[PDB]
Design a protein around this nucleic acid. Structure first.
Lengths: 119, 53, 43, 89, 121
RNA sequence: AGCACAGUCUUAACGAUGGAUGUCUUGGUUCCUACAGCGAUGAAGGCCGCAGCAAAAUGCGAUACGCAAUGAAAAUUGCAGUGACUGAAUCAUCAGAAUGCUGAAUGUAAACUACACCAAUUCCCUGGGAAUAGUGGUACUCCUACAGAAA
RNA sequence: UUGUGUUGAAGCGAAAUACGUGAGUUUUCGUGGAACAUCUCCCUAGUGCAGAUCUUGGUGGAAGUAGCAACUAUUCAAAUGAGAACUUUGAAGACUGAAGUGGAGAAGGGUUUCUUGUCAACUGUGAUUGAACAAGAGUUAGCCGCUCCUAAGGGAUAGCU
RNA sequence: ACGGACCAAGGAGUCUAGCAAAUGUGCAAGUGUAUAUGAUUCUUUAAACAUUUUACGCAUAAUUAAUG
RNA sequence: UAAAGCUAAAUAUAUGUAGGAGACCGAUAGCAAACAAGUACCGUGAGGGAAAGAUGAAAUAGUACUCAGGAAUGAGCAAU
RNA sequence: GAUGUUAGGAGGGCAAAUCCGCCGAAUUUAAGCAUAUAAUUAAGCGGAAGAAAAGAAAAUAACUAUGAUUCC
């Protein structure tokens, strides 16, 4: 019954081998359950949770690695790109909407909305 | 019609359940408007919201 | 029919699985159950 | 004589007409013309109507599992940035 | 009462009480703290633990006191080690007491409880 | 040990099937307020699966009644077994990873788990060593930029 | 406004030297196990039932009555089990008379298939049987078919409304 | 002549707009404060309170197709 | 001063969600659905579409023991 | 204009209470019924937002004139 942080430091090859041997052990426990045995049925849940955690840490490591491979470059793959909503992605940029012509820009700069108080 | 009454003049001959809408929310809408305008003037650094006409 | 499609055979397996009764030890803590002849699955 | 309008006729039911309707899953996919009756699987839309309150509400959204929509619910209140993680200990 | 943000409706709150998660039932599983402990720990109450020493002061069995054995948040009950009762089959099991009827007189300090008594301090 | 015509009806007391009346309510209804789209980045819906002993419903997607992480933080227990003296047993939040087959379904059809064609494909190590017949792509319309042909 | 409530309220059954003229009110006994009234004045309403071939739910007489009728027909001994006209074995007499209650198959049904236990309900009679219930088990293809080609035809592509 | 085998529960002149009449009330040649405005009201408060020296409806004067 | 174009507020919500309320209904009532509900079920289909809440403070007090019967079940001096 | 498994991007369907266009009835009333009325409604088809649509006069008055649009 391994834990997450104590795997968060392992090398990928050892992690994969650990996963393979855990799968083999789980298969053996399934053999035991299927055959007339009814004793070792408990540890199967622990094994099925161990393999899940190992897979999760492996997948997260792979995701960080394959994000690091593609720093910036303005052409991130679609899955590695944003996952906002459709009309958020297709929404006008804030700079795009705030952009305005020199005519009105100059007019507003010369005559801005201004604070004041009365007697 | 029955004897000495005004001639009926009811314009309800068409469907009107479809369009009846009473206003329970008069006073609370008034309160909401008050709060909104108060916040609008408070956020404006004390400058009166009203304009000369 | 002695000839059946794959999805039809799988669905028949699913329905037979559904026909199984409630386990005993759970009751220590059903009504939707058909009969092979009384009710026709229709599928 | 023997195949009359009643039981005699009733005895000849074989070779059905409707089937699984891959989209709906209901048994309203007529086979002799390749078209469903609930959705119309060859067609594009879902074949909705407004004269059928039941056929609207018993199949309207919210009935099913709602994998993605009820996941993207209650993310509005967080309004977090995707790709961000809570600060560790 | 005064805040309109928090509902006061019988149904809408009793439902919450019954279906509340165990993480919230831990809060309600509490009871009164003894008089000496009150002035010793500047607090009024604290939840129960599996290895606490409590005095029972209500119901048909309000005379004894002993260390608790186990709690059960599914039934809202706590069990004390000495007020057991036998059944018809001859098996003996601990009777169930609602925490409101008992007062703690000695509680097992812990790393976890030190900081909660700090935040109570 | 003996006495009662029977049957029909009526009245009282004691009981049988039935579940109103009376009382309860994790329910509903109406009204008020607040926010508001989802989707070729694979939608809603539907099939198929998932537990030690597991049918339904709830939940979940080959990490399958839950994984990671944050907070709360000691029980879960029907039997079994799992837990420390707290990134662990159990809760709430959930942004990280995953998210089968489908489905507008999109390589070619469907009462098929049918058949193509192009790249062989991926992992591990930091130029090699493995593995798998397994993996991606190929709908129609349209816009911008590119190419070689026409007149 | 002002009380009753675990020394048992609401309800309900029986009833009252009880009151009214009458809707009804008020009481005693039994049962009951948690709320109840205001008639001090008033405000409000999904408010008072015998019916509508009223609706929902339950119960009668009719009545232990009609009836349990086609497909010729069963009899004995034993086992089984507490139980046997309708389970099993043997004897005997018959029938179905190859257009068969015989074998294979199609559409349809979808585990009814087999084994071991099995009688709460059903098998309109009994029932140990079972197409019932419970727990397990069972469908092996280069050659049997599908997958292939084409028909009356369907759908769709270009254009056209 | 038609409905009623029996029992328990449910079961039907209600609501809205407009007018008129009868009654009670306030005010009275005026009346109503509408939308809406302000307030140390802001559980109950979706109610009560309040309305700087022509807003309107209805009434004060009728009549004729109509200039009036 | 038409035959070109843009724009927040004052306004609507029998949808979805999340909160809060009530001179509303109280299990034939209230949404069809207080419970395993758009479920069982019916129709080849468009579609139609129900019935079913309350032991008890605690079942961690759910009927142990004896006798009779095959068992159901029954009786006790036995027992919650 | 063609051609492109050319590079880069979009559209398709679900969901409707409020909203936006088209098409488009009858039941009914008129005590009959055909104009009319139900109704520029129901049904159908197609399209978005958190609000939309309308909006800066080819306006209204006729007066000592007002002055985008929307809503009570």
């Amino acid at each position: 019954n391994v834990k997450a942080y104590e795997l968060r430091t392992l090398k990928k090859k050892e992690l994969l081998d650990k996963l393979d041997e855990l799968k083999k052990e789980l298969s053996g426990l399934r053999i035991s359950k299927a055959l007339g045995n009814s004793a070792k049925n408990s540890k199967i849940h622990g094994v099925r949770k161990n393999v899940a955690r190992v897979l999760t840490v492996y997948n997260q490591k792979r995701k960080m690695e394959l994000r690091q491979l593609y720093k910036n470059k303005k052409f991130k793959p679609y899955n590695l790109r944003k996952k906002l909503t459709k009309n958020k992605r297709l929404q006008l940029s804030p700079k795009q909407k705030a952009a305005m012509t020199l005519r009105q820009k100059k007019k507003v700069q010369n005559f801005p909305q201004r604070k004041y108080l009365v007697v | 019609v029955a004897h000495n009454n005004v001639l009926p003049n009811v314009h309800l001959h068409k469907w009107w359940q479809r369009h009846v809408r009473v206003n329970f929310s008069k006073n609370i809408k008034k309160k909401k408007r008050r709060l909104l305008r108060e916040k609008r003037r408070k956020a404006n650094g004390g400058t009166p919201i009203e304009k000369l006409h | 029919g002695s000839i059946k499609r794959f999805r039809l055979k799988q669905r028949l397996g699913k329905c037979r699985r559904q026909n199984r009764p409630v386990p005993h030890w759970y009751r220590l803590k059903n009504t939707k159950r058909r009969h092979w002849r009384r009710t026709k699955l229709g599928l | 004589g023997k195949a009359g309008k009643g039981t005699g006729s009733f005895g000849k039911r074989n070779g059905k007409t409707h089937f699984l309707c891959l989209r709906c899953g209901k048994r309203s996919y007529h086979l002799q013309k390749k078209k469903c009756a609930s959705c119309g699987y060859p067609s594009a839309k879902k074949r909705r109507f407004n004269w059928s309150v039941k056929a609207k509400r018993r199949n309207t959204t919210g009935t099913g599992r709602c994998r993605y929509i009820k996941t993207l619910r209650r993310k509005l209140k967080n309004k977090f940035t995707e790709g961000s993680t809570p600060k560790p200990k | 009462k005064f805040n309109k943000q928090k509902s006061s409706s019988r149904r809408k709150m009793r439902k919450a009480h019954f279906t509340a998660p165990a993480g919230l039932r831990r809060k309600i599983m509490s009871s009164k703290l003894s008089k000496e402990l009150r002035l010793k720990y500047k607090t009024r109450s604290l939840p129960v633990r599996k290895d606490d020493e409590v005095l029972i002061c209500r119901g048909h069995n309000h005379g004894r006191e002993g260390k608790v054995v186990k709690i059960n948040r599914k039934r809202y009950k706590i069990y004390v080690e000495r007020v057991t009762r036998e059944k018809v089959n001859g098996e003996s099991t601990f009777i169930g007491i609602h925490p409101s009827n008992v007062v703690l007189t000695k509680l097992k300090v812990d790393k976890n409880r030190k900081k909660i008594l700090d935040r109570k301090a």
